[PDB]
């Protein structure tokens, strides 16, 4: 079996841990975990190709800026996340996440992921953003950002509804295998 390491980064609350936890065989309600603390492994076949992806979660706060790089050694693919209900989280993609990842993970492919796709048409989300004269991120904005940062691809998903989640991890596996 081919062994690859994946790291997920992005602002706190943008859905990183939930995205990884969709893959987990075992589930544990009413426990909030800042990061996946167990050795969670994704088993993905890509055209008769048994690949095991170790999934590494990260803490996005500024307080962890000096310890977060402990997660980066020997990474094979990055999931770089923002959330579609948070224009601020997209702004931090070029300003914080891209230079940090390119520095610690040189030449490692980046999948840019827009999380919480279910919230784009959600009435409450629309109202909360609208009161500050904001709106959910549009797909064209994610595509434009993937171009600016040189990402391998841009994909949208919802850990809540599960839409797009498979594609994220299958594309991350395809990315990890090119090197």
Ligand X SMILES: Nc1nc2c(ncn2[C@@H]2O[C@H](COP(=O)(O)OP(=O)(O)O)[C@@H](O)[C@H]2O)c(=O)[nH]1
Quick one: which segment of 9-17, 61-69, 105-113, 141-149 binds ligand X (CB under 6 A)? 9-17
Which one of residues 12, 41, 129, 177 is an interface residue with ligand X (CB under 6 A)? Answer: 12
Rounded-to-integer distance, Cα 114 and Cα 15, Å: 9
For residue 16, state whether it binds ligand X (rule: CB under 6 A).
yes
Tokens of 109: 């492919």
CA-to-CA distance for 148 and 24, rounded, in angstroms? 33
User: Distance (Å, rounded) from C-alpha 79 to C-alpha 69?
Assistant: 15
Stretch that binds Mg ion, among 14-22, 61-69, 78-86, 152-160 (CB under 5 A): 14-22
Q: Contact between 158 and ligand X (CB under 6 A)?
A: yes
Applying CB under 6 A, what is the total number of residues that bind ligand X?
14
Instruction: Report the nearest approach of Mg ion to the CB of residue 58 (Å).
Output: 8
From the list 21-29, 34-42, 45-53, 97-105, the region that binds Mg ion by CB under 5 A is 34-42
- Assess 115 for contact with Mg ion (CB under 5 A): no
Strand ranges (E), 20-144: 40-45, 50-56, 77-83, 110-115
| Residue whose C-alpha is closest to residue 19's, from 133, 162, 149 | 162
**Taking the complex as a whole, how short is the minimal distance between the CB of residue 21 and Mg ion, in angstroms?**
9
Q: CA 62 to CA 13: how far, in whole Å?
A: 13
Q: How far apart are CA 51 and CA 176, in angstroms?
A: 10
Is position 17 an interface residue for Mg ion (rule: CB under 5 A)? yes
- 7 forms bridges with which residues in the sheet? 56, 78
Residue 110 vs 119, nearer CB to ligand X? 119
Contacts of ligand X in 75-134 (CB under 6 A): 115-116, 118-119
Residues in contact with Mg ion by the rule CB under 5 A: 17, 34
């Amino acid at each position: 079996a081919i062994r690859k390491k994946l790291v997920i980064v992005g602002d706190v609350a943008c859905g990183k841990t939930c995205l990884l936890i969709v893959n987990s065989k075992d589930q544990f309600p009413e426990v909030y975990v800042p990061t996946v603390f167990e050795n969670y492994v994704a088993d993905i076949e890509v055209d008769g190709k048994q690949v095991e992806l170790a999934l590494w979660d990260t803490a996005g706060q500024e307080d962890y800026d000096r310890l977060r790089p402990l997660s980066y050694p020997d990474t094979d693919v990055i999931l770089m996340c923002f959330s579609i209900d948070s224009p601020d989280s997209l702004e931090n993609i070029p300003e914080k996440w891209t230079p940090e990842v390119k520095h610690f993970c040189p030449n490692v492919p980046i999948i840019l992921v827009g999380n919480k796709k279910d919230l784009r048409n959600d009435e409450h989300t629309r109202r909360e953003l609208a009161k500050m004269k904001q709106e959910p991120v549009k797909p064209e904005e994610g595509r434009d950002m993937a171009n600016r940062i040189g990402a391998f691809g841009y994909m949208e998903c919802s850990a809540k509804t599960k839409d797009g989640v498979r594609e994220v991890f299958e594309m991350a596996t395809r990315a990890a295998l090119q090197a």
